[PDB]
Design an enzyme around this catalytic site. Structure first.
Site, mmCIF file in Angstrom:
data_model
loop_
_atom_site.group_PDB
_atom_site.id
_atom_site.type_symbol
_atom_site.label_atom_id
_atom_site.label_comp_id
_atom_site.label_asym_id
_atom_site.label_seq_id
_atom_site.Cartn_x
_atom_site.Cartn_y
_atom_site.Cartn_z
ATOM 1 C CE1 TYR D 89 0.297 1.263 4.546
ATOM 2 C CE2 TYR D 89 0.575 -1.149 4.471
ATOM 3 C CZ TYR D 89 0.694 0.058 5.154
ATOM 4 O OH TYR D 89 1.258 0.085 6.402
ATOM 5 C CG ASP D 257 -1.396 -2.086 14.008
ATOM 6 O OD1 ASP D 257 -2.616 -2.312 14.216
ATOM 7 O OD2 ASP D 257 -0.972 -1.691 12.897
#
EC number: 2.7.1.178
Lengths: 311, 311, 311, 311, 311, 311
Positions: D89, D257
């Site tokens: 990405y 995360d």
């Protein structure tokens, strides 16, 4: 417009240095894609040129449109497709073969692969002098292939670069059948090809014999690219050969498109094949010295300087 | 483990551009050190390889261990030494000799220099197929030299790269006496050397005569590096030569380690000296095209592609 | 000369970005060293300044002399020592504490650490208006500390920055003993310090109480650095406070030296403590916005612009 | 292994500067992906952690494996899938909202999306302490969702980050139904979520009420992320809140995360939720100061330094 | 001083890569100017050298003085002129002719172009061993040309580089007239020139015939630059030829100045033409491998290393 | 065309890092110039915009035209002038004032300065909705000033940014007399100004009083820029204020042009002054976060997202 080209423009990401991509930390972005490179060469040689293509409704599709506009390509038939994304690829440079490049594509189901007959307007195509496409456009989808077959039906004259990229086809036999069908159905004013493609298509290597067989298929002019050994042009009973020049290679990607667009656009303006070939070679020499594919494609006058001054 | 190498891994700081270091503003970090580079080449040719070494308890020592782990090197015997720092060096490129590099070391009293016989476990070393080290390890300290002599006694087989770096020794006479003593004491399966080192050790430079003399010293296979003139390998009554390839040089540092680890590792798995040599040269050709020593060391399969395709 | 400083100039390597050094791939080089940074500020405020130091006979030592000569520092007493190397250090930025820098030194046994009383000429020192050094120079070796003691005995007037770097000392007690001892033997015309150093030397952090205790030790002017809460200067029972400015911190290393050299050179020229303090604050503010330590140290006239225009 | 995570690791390309991607010329490559970031945080806090995932048989898949190995993640269950490509990405930074990021994915039909029950080994999962996955893994394909449902069947204990990325789902109603099914079928030891996800899942904003409703669903501990306003942890009748810190933001991607892996791994080692929350916040503060997602995730000891020293 | 040079120092901006300037996004700054480059070579060969010039009262003028002072050039006669600006130029590299550079000047009415006879002190000039200038200084303004005429009238001995840059002159006839006129009025101890300039001045390109004609004009030593075919020096009916070395060309700009300053400073010190020529060739070889003009100009001892070791 | 702007487009060279230009080694090229930046903002808000201007017949002039075409600016009246060069400027960032920039121009006698009444066709100008220019255009030459006065006579409506750049005028009195004369002669639909300019023109700084005076001069809408304190717009008896947002400043250059072109273009299409103001501030906030002036100028829709989401 003088020239209409059908294809899929792409974003290219080049590593900053040679080596396997897993060790590359930085990538430089360029606008490329075979038919877009070709159009840049046509416009540098002072013909008008329209690219018929799709891009996604995204930053990279806008990048492609703005870049093309900046460079004088007619962008009226680059359609934004909200239904998919603009294709991209990465170049791995100089590994495992120095001075060569390998392409890693992220283009499956891209907006460019959705190019289709619907995008081909009868009236628009008939009002151009020449339609160009390549074996890449014939590979990316059944509807892009049918767009080419329709545009070639309507064209006054056609050029085709065989450009067989094995990664884009299910087999070489599929590539061969698809490309030969095109050659069999249509007269080709300029075919551009090389030993690898011609071995797949005709099972011959010798260029003199390649021209004899392509001529049977309806090809008028053949440009036969030999890379580091130069290139050869054939028309009727004229054969012209021009040796390559030695320069430091940064990335050879798109060199062939610079040569083909230069050759075809000069040939269209009435230059003979010797002049068009020598210019195609000048163009393919300059673009290999940098990471991008088309920024260094010379105008007519710059290629004449190169030819008169460089050795 | 297949191969054990003994040595001092290092952080390399490579100038971003050629020239005297006082004019260089940017440095690119690489993980290197001659036996580390060697081990990377072993694991690229699909043998297991453990480096026995010390690093400091600092970021650069963690860098070395993580990078080695990433690359499939067994790091179980790279021990962290809190008493000292991880050694580093800078490369000055292209000045005063174009296409050549000079190293400026900051490694005096480093953690890696503390490598010692206590790091060499008899059962561990006996359970390996070959032990490798170099003249650099013999130079960094007396205890590192004794680590190597101890490991060589214990090994099933040995390889040695003479690698004389005059800046690491008190005199060339000391270098000569230290390496000659190791050659007289041990059979050496593969000795890697070059004209400069051999002029010091044997007072000869002629490759056939160097082989004659090294053979009496108990060397079975000789790899004799001639740089831009290629390299020669000898075994018994057979001699293989492969010349160098012309590529743009960014940094030759570590190219001999890529060649040595590739040659040794293929020879150990049964490849003949011609095959091991040609892969050696392929590895050395790839790495000189980039700053950094070992990222472009090819796998066995990538080196085959290089040999099959690169002209 | 107006100002003589004794110290060890160094090469600084900065990462581009925060984070642990093992993940940094590029380093930018700057010429730095606490007393070198001080001298740059002195010359930016139009006094002559000579740095007494050693560097190695190597490219980094030549970089230090050429850089110092570029910026107007008298380099006639920066001695090349062929017996050792030019010290350097790396900065790890923003990890684990954002906006803070940590230094990793490679300076043990460096050329600069060999500064000794022999390098200090009685006549040369007696001819200057002021001698400056710091607790870093006191830490680097017993002979450097003896050089400072000798220069301070000969000086017409003195300045001292306490600059306690715990990593450079065998214990905090050693740093305390050594610095207090200098304060007991000599009058100090300008002492530059901060709460962390003063807590060590005096067990005091309160600025007003720090002044009282340092004034009792023979200090005339106290410059007391409070970082993001500004700085305070004291002379003859008069306090001047200047608040800090809010700017993004790229690297604070050397901002104290810019403040100290600026404050001292203005004070020496007859400027009052309020003016010299505001200029020192201008100089520290500009330095912290970039990775280098001294390139952005302003001239007197640019610091007046900063003060008149920045809010 | 202490912790098993299921997800799709990805290559991230970050622009060098803020702005629309069409004006970005350079991209820096990082290894990321939600569950991979999470595993890096678990390993930094000294638990063993295995990522179960697929990568393609390509340079970027190798990059992911080597990086993960370097960082101490168990990579035995990262399977190479020759049938597809490693997903990637791009991050568009700071446009049109400063200090925020937007992700442009090239991941459809990727090798990672082919994660499937077949990859989930009954015995392997039962011999771990905790299985973690996220709403991203539940979105990427029906078989990745079924891999999670199988792994959650076999787990001793489970964590789930809701992580609803609307671009990855056909509708928010599909996301809601898919995620609530998971919560309804299984006890969740730690749920990590935020106001946006909780509004979709429970139609509530108030965190106190979110915990009451999640607790009904079988959640034991809730980590409720508020971004610039801090984060809240709930367990039984303990509520712990910790405010965010002000730092310059380079790229917030993956901060969540880092916080979740830190929190969960500390909670697993028996730390209370106040300690685990404050560490999660320290981790999420450090990673936002750089372009990459996980290089700056602190170990336990570094986060304790941050917490004791930074304000 | 040993050598006085009169000229206009300049800031050079180089692209990183070949191509037309409109596609270049980054430029690297270097301090250059033909006579400044010459002075750097003089001081690298251990003679004192003073540059008489003007620069603007601006950052680029300060960059020129500081840089010159760094490298050992006497800057006492580099005058700051507040009435105008420091001239600069950009180099377009490799387009349309690979490996060739084209300069784009922003120097019209610059401070440097205001060099005039007033700047030339009779006593100062009479005290030097040699005065040097070039056809660039003759071109920049009538007052610069008059400065050279005045300095040449006062000089003990003279050197001249013809360096005809057609863009700087109203016509080639004007360049020819102006340069011939200097050759008719003065004995020239060293003339540096090439076939392009000599074809203009004399209608001759043959080196042996060029010597004969220049010797008839009062030139003692002729240095004749043949680029990639080496250089030739003549003195008293004796020819010395030195072939060029093959290196990758990054930027040849200023390579002639490195050759000229090196040749002249060695000759002045009593070196024979063969030695001075081989050193000039070493200096030009090193400069062309990088974008800067003078950073890689070698000292006498480094040039001896190059000559003894490079092949 | 909706909007015609008259001005001199320029190439901007932005230092890669903050500090005095003599220490800057790298420069990043951008296309800029105040009216060009303005036109980019007009076409981002979906009105057609033509720039009337001259560029040189050189690479930098081709750069300007291609970039403008890329961005949707009508380039039909940017004429190439062979008699002169395309003007450029350098930005020194963050020194001596943090977060502010200083411009060093190389534009004296440039092609753009040759803009003249003969470039202004009466029928073309009458067929537009509004004509814009600035005090910079009034300063660059007498003929450019007369071009503006002529275009303003002919326009249906006018906008003027006072933009006094003291370095471009012989005196502030001249600036004052020139701009005041234009204000007295013409109704101005939107005047954009700031305290510094208004103190010069009107001898007031109070925004309400400046509005009172400008209103009597025939200004309908006043945009009054207060920088970090935000901006105010006035029309009739209504006043809108929006404060600035806190973002990290890379380069504020061109931020007022982004604000002005965004405000004017939205006001022209019927948006109220509050909406036009808030979008103005959004545009100016985005552009200051990067080097370069206009790449981050948002579209109408992106500025709405910014206003709706950024806090």
């Amino acid at each position: 417009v003088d020239v209409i080209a059908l294809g899929e423009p792409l974003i290219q990401f080049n590593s900053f240095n040679p080596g396997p991509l897993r060790f590359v930390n930085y990538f430089e972005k360029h606008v490329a894609g075979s038919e877009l490179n070709f159009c840049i060469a046509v416009v540098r040689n002072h013909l008008s040129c329209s690219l018929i293509a799709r891009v996604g409704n995204d930053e990279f599709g806008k990048n492609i449109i703005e870049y093309s506009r900046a460079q004088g390509i007619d962008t009226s038939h680059i359609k934004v497709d909200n239904e998919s994304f603009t294709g991209i690829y990465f170049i791995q440079r100089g590994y495992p073969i120095p001075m060569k490049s390998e392409l890693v594509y992220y283009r499956k189901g891209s907006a460019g692969s959705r190019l289709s007959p619907e995008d081909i307007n009868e009236n628009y195509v008939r009002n151009s002098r020449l339609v160009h496409s390549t074996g890449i456009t014939l590979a990316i989808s059944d509807n892009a292939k049918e767009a080419v077959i329709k545009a070639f039906e309507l064209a006054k004259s056609r050029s085709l670069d065989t450009n067989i990229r094995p990664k884009l086809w299910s087999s070489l036999e599929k590539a061969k059948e698809t490309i030969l069908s095109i050659l069999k159905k249509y007269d080709i004013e300029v075919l551009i090809t090389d030993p690898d493609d011609t071995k797949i298509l005709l099972d011959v290597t010798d260029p003199d014999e390649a021209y004899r067989k392509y001529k049977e298929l309806g090809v008028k002019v053949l440009l036969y690219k030999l890379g580091s050994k130069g290139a050869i042009a054939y028309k009727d009973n004229v054969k012209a050969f021009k040796d390559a020049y030695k320069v430091p290679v940064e990335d050879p990607t798109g060199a062939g498109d610079a040569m083909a667009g230069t050759f075809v656009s000069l040939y269209l303006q009435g230059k003979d094949i010797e002049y068009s070939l020598a210019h195609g070679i000048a163009a393919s020499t300059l673009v290999i010295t940098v990471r991008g594919d088309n920024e260094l494609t010379p105008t007519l006058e710059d290629a004449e300087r190169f030819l008169n001054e460089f050795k």
